[PDB]
mmCIF file of all heavy atoms in Angstrom:
data_model
loop_
_atom_site.group_PDB
_atom_site.id
_atom_site.type_symbol
_atom_site.label_atom_id
_atom_site.label_comp_id
_atom_site.label_asym_id
_atom_site.label_seq_id
_atom_site.Cartn_x
_atom_site.Cartn_y
_atom_site.Cartn_z
ATOM 1 N N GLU K 99 -53.982 93.997 22.432
ATOM 2 C CA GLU K 99 -55.411 94.277 22.525
ATOM 3 C C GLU K 99 -56.206 93.345 21.615
ATOM 4 O O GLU K 99 -57.273 92.832 21.995
ATOM 5 C CB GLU K 99 -55.673 95.737 22.158
ATOM 6 C CG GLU K 99 -55.197 96.752 23.195
ATOM 7 C CD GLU K 99 -55.655 96.441 24.605
ATOM 8 O OE1 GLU K 99 -56.816 96.750 24.938
ATOM 9 O OE2 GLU K 99 -54.850 95.891 25.384
ATOM 10 N N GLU K 129 -62.134 96.040 23.678
ATOM 11 C CA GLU K 129 -60.799 95.617 23.176
ATOM 12 C C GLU K 129 -60.731 95.874 21.671
ATOM 13 O O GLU K 129 -59.638 96.196 21.191
ATOM 14 C CB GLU K 129 -60.503 94.172 23.575
ATOM 15 C CG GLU K 129 -60.711 93.893 25.054
ATOM 16 C CD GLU K 129 -59.765 94.578 26.025
ATOM 17 O OE1 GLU K 129 -59.117 95.565 25.636
ATOM 18 O OE2 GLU K 129 -59.684 94.124 27.182
ATOM 19 N N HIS K 132 -59.889 99.495 21.423
ATOM 20 C CA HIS K 132 -58.493 99.752 21.769
ATOM 21 C C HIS K 132 -57.560 99.406 20.614
ATOM 22 O O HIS K 132 -56.600 100.139 20.334
ATOM 23 C CB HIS K 132 -58.109 98.961 23.017
ATOM 24 C CG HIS K 132 -58.875 99.350 24.242
ATOM 25 N ND1 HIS K 132 -58.805 98.636 25.418
ATOM 26 C CD2 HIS K 132 -59.721 100.379 24.475
ATOM 27 C CE1 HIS K 132 -59.578 99.207 26.324
ATOM 28 N NE2 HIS K 132 -60.146 100.267 25.777
ATOM 29 N N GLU K 194 -53.804 92.715 33.139
ATOM 30 C CA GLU K 194 -54.452 94.052 33.021
ATOM 31 C C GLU K 194 -54.344 94.847 34.324
ATOM 32 O O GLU K 194 -54.172 96.071 34.238
ATOM 33 C CB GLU K 194 -55.926 93.907 32.645
ATOM 34 C CG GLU K 194 -56.195 94.078 31.160
ATOM 35 C CD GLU K 194 -57.625 93.793 30.730
ATOM 36 O OE1 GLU K 194 -58.362 93.173 31.520
ATOM 37 O OE2 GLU K 194 -57.999 94.194 29.608
ATOM 38 N N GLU K 228 -60.346 100.121 30.947
ATOM 39 C CA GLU K 228 -59.702 99.040 31.741
ATOM 40 C C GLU K 228 -60.320 99.034 33.146
ATOM 41 O O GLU K 228 -60.408 97.949 33.738
ATOM 42 C CB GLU K 228 -58.187 99.237 31.741
ATOM 43 C CG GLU K 228 -57.574 99.082 30.361
ATOM 44 C CD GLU K 228 -57.842 97.735 29.711
ATOM 45 O OE1 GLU K 228 -57.790 96.724 30.428
ATOM 46 O OE2 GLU K 228 -58.096 97.698 28.490
ATOM 47 N N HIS K 231 -62.920 96.435 33.132
ATOM 48 C CA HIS K 231 -62.218 95.168 32.926
ATOM 49 C C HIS K 231 -61.722 94.503 34.213
ATOM 50 O O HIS K 231 -61.907 93.294 34.417
ATOM 51 C CB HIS K 231 -61.066 95.402 31.952
ATOM 52 C CG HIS K 231 -61.506 95.859 30.598
ATOM 53 N ND1 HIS K 231 -60.623 96.071 29.562
ATOM 54 C CD2 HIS K 231 -62.736 96.138 30.107
ATOM 55 C CE1 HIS K 231 -61.289 96.464 28.492
ATOM 56 N NE2 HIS K 231 -62.574 96.514 28.797
HETATM 57 FE FE1 LIG A 601 -57.884 96.662 26.551
#
Side-chain angles (χ1 to χ4, degrees):
Chain K
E99 289 310 280
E129 309 293 18
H132 297 171
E194 262 174 344
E228 295 302 320
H231 298 183

